[PDB]
Ligand binder design. Sequence first.
Ligand code: CLA
Ligand code: CLA
Ligand code: CLA
Ligand code: CLA
Ligand code: CLA
Ligand code: CLA
Ligand code: PL9
Ligand code: BCR
Ligand code: OEX
Ligand code: FE2
Lengths: 245, 37, 59, 137, 157, 334, 35, 30, 34, 58, 93, 136, 52
Amino acid sequence: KSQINELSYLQVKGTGLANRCAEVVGEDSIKPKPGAKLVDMCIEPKAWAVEEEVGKAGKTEKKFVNSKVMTRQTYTLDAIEGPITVDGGKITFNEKEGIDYAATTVQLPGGERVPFLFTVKDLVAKGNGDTFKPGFQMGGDFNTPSYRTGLFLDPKGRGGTTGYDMAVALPALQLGEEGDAELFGENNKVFDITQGRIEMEVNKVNAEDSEIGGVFVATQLSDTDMGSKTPKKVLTKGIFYAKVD
Amino acid sequence: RLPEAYVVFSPIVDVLPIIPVFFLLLAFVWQAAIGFR
Amino acid sequence: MITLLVALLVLISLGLVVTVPVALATPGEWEIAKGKFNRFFQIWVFLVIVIAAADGISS
Amino acid sequence: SYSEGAAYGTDQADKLYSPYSVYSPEGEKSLYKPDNAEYLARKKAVLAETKNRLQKIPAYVDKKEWFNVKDELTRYMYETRGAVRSLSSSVTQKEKAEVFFRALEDTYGAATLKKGDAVKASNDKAIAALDAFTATL
Amino acid sequence: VWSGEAYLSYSLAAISLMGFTAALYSWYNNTAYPSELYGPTGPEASQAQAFTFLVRDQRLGANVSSAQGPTGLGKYLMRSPSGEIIFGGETMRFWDLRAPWVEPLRGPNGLDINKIKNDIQPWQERRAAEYMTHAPLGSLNSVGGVATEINSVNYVS
Amino acid sequence: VSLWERFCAWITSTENRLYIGWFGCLMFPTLLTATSCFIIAFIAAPPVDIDGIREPVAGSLLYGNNIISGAVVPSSNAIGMHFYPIWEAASIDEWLYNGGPYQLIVLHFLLGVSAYMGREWELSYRLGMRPWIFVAFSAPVAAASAVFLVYPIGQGSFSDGMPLGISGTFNFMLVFQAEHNILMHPFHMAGVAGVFGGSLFSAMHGSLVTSSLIRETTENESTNYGYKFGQEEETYNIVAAHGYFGRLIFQYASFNNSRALHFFLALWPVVGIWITSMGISTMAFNLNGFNFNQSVVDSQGRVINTWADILNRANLGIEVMHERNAHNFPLDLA
Amino acid sequence: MLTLKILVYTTVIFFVSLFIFGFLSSDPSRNPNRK
Amino acid sequence: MEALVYTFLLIGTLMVIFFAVFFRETPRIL
Amino acid sequence: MINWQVIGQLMSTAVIMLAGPAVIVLLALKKGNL
Amino acid sequence: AYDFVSQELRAAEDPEFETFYTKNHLLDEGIRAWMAAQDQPHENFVFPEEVLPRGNAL
Amino acid sequence: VIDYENIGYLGGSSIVDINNANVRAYLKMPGMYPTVAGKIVSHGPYSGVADLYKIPGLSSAEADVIKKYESRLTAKTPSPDYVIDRINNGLYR
Amino acid sequence: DLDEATRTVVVDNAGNTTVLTPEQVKRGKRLFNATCGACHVGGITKTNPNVGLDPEALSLATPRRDNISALVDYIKNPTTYDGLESIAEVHPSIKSADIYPRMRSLTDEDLYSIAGHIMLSPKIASEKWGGGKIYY
Amino acid sequence: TEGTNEWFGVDDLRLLAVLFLGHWAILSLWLGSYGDSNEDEDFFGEIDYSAR
Ligand code: CLA
Ligand code: CLA
Ligand code: CLA
Ligand code: CLA
Ligand code: CLA
Ligand code: CLA
Ligand SMILES: CC(C)=CCC/C(C)=C/CC/C(C)=C/CC/C(C)=C/CC/C(C)=C/CC/C(C)=C/CC/C(C)=C/CC/C(C)=C/CC/C(C)=C/CC1=CC(=O)C(C)=C(C)C1=O
Ligand SMILES: CC1=C(/C=C/C(C)=C/C=C/C(C)=C/C=C/C=C(C)/C=C/C=C(C)/C=C/C2=C(C)CCCC2(C)C)C(C)(C)CCC1
Ligand code: OEX
Ligand SMILES: [Fe+2]
């Protein structure tokens, strides 16, 4: 807000305030200009859910169980820039820069730890109408990069762009015509790009201050450690905030 | 370095911080000459 | 003149340290002769003020 | 000799600043000449932009942003005190600069205490004080 | 105990309290011990490295905010466990580093990304490069750098 | 008569089985909480992000370890030096992920060991003993506080603190070698001389007593039964063991005084471990050991290798491999 | 989590107060010499 | 199945420490 | 070019390192209260 | 006593399982590769720069 | 990847890749580091050497040093793990 | 064994070679470690490891920098690696020597010996100079 | 909220009433014997053996 901007740095630190997106006040309309460029879009999710096999009364249909985040306060995106292009039918947004990834890890019932990169990279938003309204609702696809960049070294010392490529303390595996092709999947490290679909919804606007904010819902796919396991579908919900300029 | 009226004594000043160690050794030399009694 | 007086200030403090604890650890040497030595303290203190005077004039 | 460690003065041919140094003094044959105009033009250029960085001060006090006024006078203006002390050559030029500093230190002392008028009052005591500095020398 | 040696062992307990505390002022505090005089602190030379390569790769047209690190974290800018924008690496432990050459780039949230993209002053580059090469890492024979540095420099902080 | 005087009489009673004392008021609650959390965290504790890079390192027995590899992992690099109790963690699952129980065990350990040390003083006061057994115990208290407390302070994080385990100890010693060169530091040199000397004078004193025992048994029963407990006769000819060592090296190198002999057994190790534990302390603040790399050159100026250059190439191997993902910048400042 | 936290400050300053008021309880006089 | 042996060795070691402290053969003069 | 610094330092230690035991030696000859 | 094979077979099949024990093997690859060039000049190990196991950015 | 083709075009074959090489690979070409090499590494996927002239913000001098080494520049398939660490891959002399 | 053929270094952009007198190689080491060696220790650059003091890396700069006359040119006027713009404001120099207090007292022969040390050190140690920690 | 600069880690008001009732609950035990004694009785020892 501007109320957050009143504070100094020593009053914010250690209080968990910089993690939290602003609260926009009031509702009206604002029109995106021709050269309109979005300035301070922050996204913070308030709840997480992982698609699992749930234990109902007699059936095992797939449902979302929620989860507790374990990385502490590092989940919020910030400073996301981008120009707001005006197509004729629908106003669009394409993000350009800003902190658009925040790696985090949630824990399921059972003790399973599921990390996932929460990101909005290469987002193509499209929403009904032209002007931002309390009934406005935009969304679109984003590309999730892999959770580890290819020069990550696993405990044996094997990466996609560096490291070894065989079980380094098992030297008798590469004997014979077959070699170590039985454990081939854990040697080949494949950088993976998946898709994610976010759906935002503006409901409170200032036009005298040119800042909007509302509730979103985002679904994406968790990580796999370069093909080590099957990734799992992760749903999340929260609130965002943006400065329309 | 030292001011120009004092650049002459630049060797003597270099010895000076060592001199507090020499008081620790002066006690034992004095205890030797007294015969450790 | 500062380089001449400080050189005279060091040579007196050589002459004192060799002689003053010898004058004190002896059972009577300080009581028998201190008015001899008390001049050398008053000369030594007087040199510090002369050097402090000559340093302020020269700066 | 090549590996002699305590050759204080017999090694080199040029006289050093001190036996405990490697460098020669600030005398002749040096390549740094402090009378050069590009050193004066560098120090003059930060004095010009300092007034331009100081007129943006009330725009943040008209707003509510106190974090931007505490560091605007330290982000760019860090290089001011190195220059305005160096440009101060004559007698009355020197005691004109501490009028500018004490007026400037109260802008920072009021921004931490979040006093709106005390920034806007002491800002005008600073633009008027750099006006006194630049116009003389 | 009202005796002669007991008062001496009262002092020796308290002088050891002052002994540790002056030895911990000199490692962390950059206010009573200015980095212009005593050299950069332990925490300060860890942040000056990450700031220098921040300036270095920003000149190559790289978006440093969205620059995904090799672990998946921020290569340059990441977020502290209290929420603030900090420097990334092993320097994420020293995220409380408050120094007069980095505090021009602060905000309420932390390192202001708009101020990093636009306002980096060259005296900060001359300071972070000075405090990287004169980090407080030495040896007893007074050669600087890491424990595996060759014998050319003569510096212990 | 009062309730407090009847409680001070019990808590300072030497007639208890174990003397509790006033230091036991904060020895026993501290060390039983360091114990009861250690047994659970060593057996059943989920993996811990130590490098702060969200790569959790398993350290407990239920997650596929043994006595050697299992270890209570230090806290995160993300936390660092911050105090991280259970109530400042928003769940226990968030506490156990970020290296929770390393701070709970260590801080209740160093309070309980510094109270076990003062408890050794207290009973020496109430028994009439001269007091200074607790000064000899200051030497492992100096060394325990050096690797768990002082070294995380000067390095700025508990993640550089020592892992509570067996294989975690050798991860600690090797990484400390590459980054600080402890073997060339003269305070590890002064305590290797403390424990090689300490184990020498232990087995040298223990042999000369057992050599000069007096006949009090038969050849059928044990040697040890010639000592009745609480007897006032001396159980070995001390003149005999003095004449032996007085000929084994020479005459003037032998302590005829048994009090000055039994003092030198307490001096040599304890001074050797005081000095050593202030080697870790001065190397916690990056005042490393000696560095003689590229020190010997010919007249042409080419570097002639020494044994320190071979030792350097062993340090360069550990330096480029420790925390192989945690680094992003060319110099390990931490 | 603020219910556990209350329980710890009870237990700490229970035993810390037994320590503080233990040595204030005429503790030098508790020796085998006299009294 | 494997860690069950390690736990039994550890708590079994702490048993004989308990019996050695409290059920010790108390030494007596005369 | 005869290295006046080292000549100055080695004499000035040897003056001072011999001015300490000379305080004791002059007392041992004098049989004063050591 | 070089390896626990139950630790080594598991860390090969599961590229997420890390102990302190497998951390000591990567410290030993640095000792086996970096010093062995200058350790044994009789054997003439000429290692390229690209086979020596380095970590990230060290 | 165990078996990755075009390892040579990254840094060492003296015919460089565009969309996979490190910015250190353009150091061997006099004139391009850091300015002209900084723009090539920063932008997205290229399909040819003709797409090097499509960079927003080129001079005639920036197109000049590309014109010299356009035989040595060539473009390959972007494998997305090399495309991330194009500014910094953690290699330092 | 500092032969005059080994002390003979290249002096101009054309390729003439002159020899360094034995006080040049001695002051050249003391001044380099005191002034330049805080970041350029052993030929690598700490704050920008791409641009080293290698004889390969000095040659590939857009003005060729291998010469003694080219290195003392760089000290009084440091351009970038492609030589388009000046970085005298951030590299220590003679032109921008009001900010850097370390270079206010340097003569022509002092930079002649520092640049002598940068050029004569790859001839002594062929691979250690600017080879990083691999060649320590 | 960890790195707040709050006295003795007292975050909430409820933790004070824990501290005051801990020192005082043992203080009142201590005053049951060593309190209400003569505050004007001296000794020229190093150590006092006055009473219980
Ligand atoms: C004998 C007496 C005496 C003494 C003590 C001094 C002392 C001094 N004179 Mg001075 N002077 C003297 C006689 C004396 N003068 C005479 C006779 C003349 C001719 C009339 C002058 C003319 C003169 C001039 C013209 C100037 C001086 C200046 C100075 C000061 C130099 C420091 C400085 O630059 O100021 C800055 C101040 C300091 C550095 C503070 C130094 C003192 C600190 C606090 C140390 C003291 C610590 C403590 C006492 C020591 C512990 C002892 C404990 C064990 C008891 C110094 C305080 C200069 C001056 O004052 O300039 C400002 C100067 O320009 N003098
Ligand atoms: C040759 C023998 C010798 C020597 C050299 C010293 C030297 C010292 N003693 Mg001392 N002492 C000795 C024998 C000796 N003692 C004996 C035999 C006893 C009887 C057991 C004592 C009892 C004694 C006590 C009870 C205390 C000292 C203290 C001190 C220190 C005063 C300086 C100081 O603290 O600066 C550091 C402090 C400052 C620079 C700040 C200024 C503060 C002033 C100077 C404090 C002065 C305290 C005063 C000396 C203590 C009163 C003693 C008095 C009742 C006789 C100094 C290290 C004092 C101390 O603090 O050190 C442990 C102290 O409390 N001594
Ligand atoms: C081997 C002996 C030795 C040596 C050489 C030093 C050396 C030093 N110690 Mg030290 N220290 C030692 C042993 C030693 N220590 C021991 C054994 C202890 C106990 C563990 C300590 C505890 C200690 C502390 C607690 C501190 C030092 C500090 C220092 C440094 C500055 C000295 C200082 O503060 O003066 C102090 C001088 C005095 C107290 C005398 C009075 C000074 C008056 C008050 C000054 C007034 C100034 C005033 C503004 C002047 C205006 C004048 C104007 C009005 C005219 C210095 C490097 C300080 C430091 O820098 O810490 C890193 C510090 O804080 N030491
Ligand atoms: C009695 C012994 C004892 C001691 C000393 C500690 C100490 C500690 N415990 Mg522990 N604990 C204990 C028993 C003890 N515990 C028991 C029996 C249990 C089982 C219930 C626990 C369970 C437990 C848990 C579960 C946790 C701790 C934690 C902690 C740490 C912080 C707790 C805290 O806020 O303290 C409160 C302390 C104070 C308010 C300070 C009291 C100090 C007084 C005021 C003396 C100071 C005197 C003063 C300065 C005089 C001023 C005079 C004036 C004129 C200036 C600390 C190391 C936490 C931890 O380590 O996390 C990392 C944690 O999570 N403890
Ligand atoms: C010949 C080889 C050799 C030898 C003899 C030593 C000798 C030593 N090294 Mg060393 N070292 C060597 C090679 C060697 N080193 C090499 C090659 C390296 C490089 C890898 C190192 C790296 C190294 C490091 C990094 C460290 C040492 C340390 C030490 C010291 C260990 C003593 C110690 O910690 O006990 C002191 C005792 C303790 C720490 C234990 C305290 C225990 C408390 C008091 C109670 C615990 C009670 C327990 C929980 C329960 C009790 C039982 C219960 C049932 C009741 C000793 C001087 C350490 C040191 O310097 O001292 C700190 C150290 O940190 N060395
Ligand atoms: C071949 C046998 C041998 C010998 C003679 C030594 C000797 C030494 N080692 Mg070493 N060491 C050895 C084998 C040996 N080591 C082995 C096999 C290993 C493991 C692989 C080590 C590992 C090791 C480490 C890790 C360290 C040493 C250290 C030391 C030094 C001090 C140790 C000490 O004081 O111990 C305690 C024993 C005593 C105090 C008894 C006295 C021993 C002295 C040397 C004999 C005195 C006789 C005298 C010189 C003759 C004059 C007397 C005459 C007038 C009668 C000393 C030079 C330390 C060091 O570097 O110090 C510089 C050290 O850090 N050693
Ligand atoms: C003529 C020709 C042909 C020409 C050639 C010339 C020629 C002949 C040359 C040959 C000469 C030649 C070399 C001979 C010299 C002989 C010689 C000395 C050779 C050996 C070489 C050598 C290196 C020796 C030095 C090593 C040495 C033996 C060191 C001794 C170490 C030492 C002093 C240790 C003392 C340690 C110590 C204080 C121990 C006591 C503490 C301890 C707990 C002991 C236990 C103990 C002690 C008691 O005291 C008592 C009471 C009891 C109860 C008790 O528990
Ligand atoms: C200040 C001054 C001064 C003065 C000085 C002084 C006076 C000093 C002193 C000093 C001293 C005071 C010295 C001392 C010395 C001593 C010594 C050097 C000794 C040593 C010896 C040895 C070491 C030996 C010993 C021993 C013995 C005898 C026997 C037993 C054993 C032994 C071995 C231990 C002068 C004038 C210059 C001037 C300037 C200033
Ligand atoms: O955390 Mn444990 O190890 Ca001490 O150095 Mn820096 O930090 Mn991390 O790296 Mn290397
Ligand atoms: Fe014995």
